């Protein structure tokens, strides 16, 4: 009755054939049942108390936490193991707790429905005066990283996608980047049709499944069937129902073009990319940067460990947590309070930098112009842990220093 639907390293999704999925956690071969509730509960809290503000009520969809029979979680886990990539069989499924989270299936909701999930990654190159390496002001994080992934053997080759192409307003750049994602999908593009993964774990094999959409006789080459996708997706990304209202974060745009991008005024105010980009800007300092402040908070919390709970570090992510994030002032007064605020803003921006966007297309409310009804949603919105900020500091040095070798 349930089927594998995809995963990352934090969670696993399985779809109901008869329109809801289930997000299951995944640990190695260690936590308690009490612990796992709070974690999942915080993700719900965070979503509706923080992200629902930053990205709008209809973009962020959440569903409540559920409890299920423990034998039933054992009886699904064994079936799935053949479906899961060998890469992600390092970590096992959350089988013991019996808890899971139920999100509505965006792929499903007679209706032929095409779905494009993107993991756009970071849309800006850092501007902060904390950055010690020169190359970080010229090249984006994504483009530098790509090197170390291919040298590691995570992916077979370099991607020509730069996120700044996609996060720029320009349709010609946005098309190029979308073309570049289709050539090297990696974990940045997946395409679904009627609840089924049809692309990014053959350019011409895609056109077989997409011909019935954009041309419902003939004759249309793959070049045509692919170009409509690129154009439709670009229009839906430049779509907005809120060109007027003032956002929560009014962070000013500060570089517009990456040096590494092989290609050749701004994003619409209400569009999901623009709202996603603002949340990412909360990293006003760099990690270089934010890490000194992390240690300032850390040494305080080690002096006073009961403070970790009372200062809402790992929860609750409630209406007061939200309001603390609003203080944009960047000039350091040497306090814990200042250092703590920036640590929480970074974690939030860190979560906006790893999130996926789900674009649904179906004919048939709202339309790019037969004329295709569309919805736009955002995913992977659970807060990055406080504890992982040192890992991000160390990883930042490695990407830059290795890429700097390659010049
Ligand atoms: O497993 P990957 O496809 O390589 O993706 C990972 C993963 O994100 P997903 O689980 O959503 O796929 C990490 O997120 P966590 O699950 O650990 O929270 C994230 O790590 P951080 O947010 O801690 O940075 C990391 O991003 P990054 O590479 O920027 O460190 C990102 O990897 P890539 O996007 O680089 O593939
Ligand atoms: Zn780039």
Curated annotation (Swiss-Prot):
Q: Which top EC class applies here?
A: transferase
GO terms for biological process, alphabetical: positive regulation of transcription of nucleolar large rRNA by RNA polymerase I
Residue window of motif EXKPK motif: 117-121
Among the GO molecular function terms of this UniProt record, one is: inositol-1,3,4,5,6-pentakisphosphate 2-kinase activity
- Quote the Gene3D superfamilies the UniProt record gives: Inositol-pentakisphosphate 2-kinase, N-lobe (3.30.200.110)
What role does this protein play? Phosphorylates Ins(1,3,4,5,6)P5 at position 2 to form Ins(1,2,3,4,5,6)P6 (InsP6 or phytate). InsP6 is involved in many processes such as mRNA export, non-homologous end-joining, endocytosis, ion channel regulation. It also protects cells from TNF-alpha-induced apoptosis.
| Catalytic activity reported | 1D-myo-inositol 1,3,4,5,6-pentakisphosphate + ATP = 1D-myo-inositol hexakisphosphate + ADP + H(+)
Protein name from the UniProt record:
Inositol-pentakisphosphate 2-kinase
Q: Does the keyword Nucleotide-binding apply?
A: yes
The enzyme's E.C. designation: 2.7.1.158
Q: What is its main location?
A: cytoplasm
Let me know which tissues express this protein, per UniProt.
In brain, it is expressed throughout the hippocampus (CA1, CA2, CA3 and dentate gyrus), inner layers of the cerebral cortex, and Purkinje cells of the cerebellum. In heart, it is expressed in cardiomyocytes but not in interstitial cells, blood vessels, or valves. Also expressed in testis.
Q: What Pfam family is a match for this entry?
A: Ins_P5_2-kin
Relay the domain remarks: The EXKPK motif is conserved in inositol-pentakisphosphate 2-kinases of both family 1 and 2.
Q: Where in the cell is it found?
A: Cytoplasm; Nucleus
- Report keywords, A-Z: ATP-binding, Cytoplasm, Kinase, Nucleotide-binding, Nucleus, Transferase
